[PDB]
Amino acid sequence: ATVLLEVPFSARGDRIPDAVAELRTREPIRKVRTITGAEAWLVSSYALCTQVLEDRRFSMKETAAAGAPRLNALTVPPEVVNNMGNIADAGLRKAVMKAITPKAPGLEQFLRDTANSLLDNLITEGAPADLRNDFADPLATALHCKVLGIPQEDGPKLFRSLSIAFMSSADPIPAAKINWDRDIEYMAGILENPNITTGLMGELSRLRKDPAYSHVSDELFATIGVTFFGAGVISTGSFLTTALISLIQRPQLRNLLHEKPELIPAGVEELLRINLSFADGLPRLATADIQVGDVLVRKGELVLVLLEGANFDPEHFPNPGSIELDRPNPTSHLAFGRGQHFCPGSALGRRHAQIGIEALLKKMPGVDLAVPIDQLVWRTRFQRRIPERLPVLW
Ligand code: HEM
Ligand SMILES: Oc1ccc(-n2cncn2)cc1
């Protein structure tokens, strides 16, 4: 006898497990058991992942209901799972989206100057360098302090919450409450701080005192600061780190992009497509009985949308393991999700990776791993796949 197939399959972010293609071909929706012991439907083809993500009867908000089958334990309060819905209901969606575009005057030059400073510091210190802790994550943190309008020197303490806040745990995490309550108190103080006049928190601070938003709660304003910092920093730092592995493992492409930097946006879109940064399928709870493939999903059941299942599906992306800069469908991957919950930071996340890669390739054209690839240590039981250190030489 064996037990039901367990997810996730592997915390490694540098290779896709052969099980994914076997599932996708033979059983593109099939039952699995999550780390909590709950059963779920794992969906692994492009067609069925898109069907679930575009049908709001597969609800994100409902995953937080008491008694639901769970992928993992909540690390935020249950109403915060509906964060974008609460931002939309408060009349703040357009304002939030406007503040986190990468097109803000000076923002790109700030990102390039920051990237070049971090790189020069590594060059001065000498190889080996850790491109996660001393490049990708400080670049993500500096970017998000600038986009929020908060002091750069407050970035490192806010960042140190994230190794707990983005855990994928079977059980509630006492330190995630301690750090969440402290980080909310910090954002509530930012909203009362007259020095904060720029970025997303300077905008929220003004709208909080405008009569049209006098009944939006202070808790929501503070929650937008904590969630957009945390989601943006973990997501951009982790994507850029694993994209740098994928580039270092393709010297032919590295060299192409160094020679023709105008191809960096196409290269980043393929690095998004092949990225294994999300450690778990995206969860949704069915609110109706819905046919998906050969399965009738029942109301109340959990569905998990496996992004690499869609993004490596050869029916959509032929030769899916290869980075090809001339595909006819290059932005149709699911790396930012799809539908109602498509990532609101997508443009910012693209620009952070394009600028970090352009800066790295000009400063360290010979960048290579300084350890054999199997020696990277992959974080476990986390919502992202990331190596704990990324040692390189150049
Ligand atoms: C390359 C970087 C990024 C990747 C790969 C990424 C990926 C994703 C994905 C896959 C979703 C959909 C989750 C779902 O449907 O269940 C999502 C949602 C989200 N992302 Fe991003 N993200 C990135 C950067 C950002 C940035 C820069 C921010 C903010 C500054 C951000 C904020 C959010 C938020 C707040 C949501 C929830 C949206 C909702 O619930 O409607 N992300 N992201
Ligand atoms: O809109 C958001 C929802 C959940 C999160 N987090 C999930 N784990 C940690 N934060 C961040 C933003």
Curated annotation (Swiss-Prot):
SUPFAM superfamilies per the UniProt record, alphabetical: Cytochrome P450
Cofactor dependence: heme
Marked site (Important for the position of heme) residue numbers: P344
Molecular function GO terms recorded: heme binding; iron ion binding; monooxygenase activity; oxidoreductase activity, acting on paired donors, with incorporation or reduction of molecular oxygen
Catalytic reaction annotation: cyclo(L-tyrosyl-L-tyrosyl) + 2 reduced [2Fe-2S]-[ferredoxin] + O2 + 2 H(+) = mycoclysin + 2 oxidized [2Fe-2S]-[ferredoxin] + 2 H2O
InterPro entries: Cyt_P450, Cyt_P450_B, Cyt_P450_CS, Cyt_P450_sf
Any one Gene Ontology cellular component term annotated for this protein: cytoplasm
Enzyme class, first EC level, given as a word: oxidoreductase
Keywords: Cytoplasm, Heme, Iron, Metal-binding, Monooxygenase, Oxidoreductase
Annotated site, Participates in a stacking interactions with the tyrosyl of cYY, chain positions: F166, W180
EC code(s) of this entry: 1.14.19.70
Pfam families in UniProt: p450
Broad class of the protein's primary localization: cytoplasm
Amino-acid positions noted as binding heme in the UniProt annotation, renumbered to this chain: R284, H341, C343
Record flagged with keyword Cytoplasm: yes
Presence of the UniProt keyword Heme in the record: yes
Function noted in UniProt: Catalyzes C-C bond formation between the carbons ortho to the phenolic hydroxyl of cyclo(L-tyr-L-tyr) (cYY) producing mycocyclosin. Can also use cyclo(L-Tyr-L-Phe) (cYF), cyclo(L-Tyr-L-Trp) (cYW) and cyclo(L-Tyr-L-3,4-dihydroxyphenylalanine) (cY-DOPA) as substrate.
PANTHER family xref list: CYTOCHROME P450 YJIB-RELATED (PTHR46696:SF1), P450, PUTATIVE (EUROFUNG)-RELATED (PTHR46696)
The family this protein is said to belong to: Belongs to the cytochrome P450 family.
Official protein name in the record: Mycocyclosin synthase
Organism listed in the record: Mycobacterium tuberculosis (strain CDC 1551 / Oshkosh)
Organism lineage string: Bacteria, Bacillati, Actinomycetota, Actinomycetes, Mycobacteriales
Gene giving rise to this polypeptide: cyp121
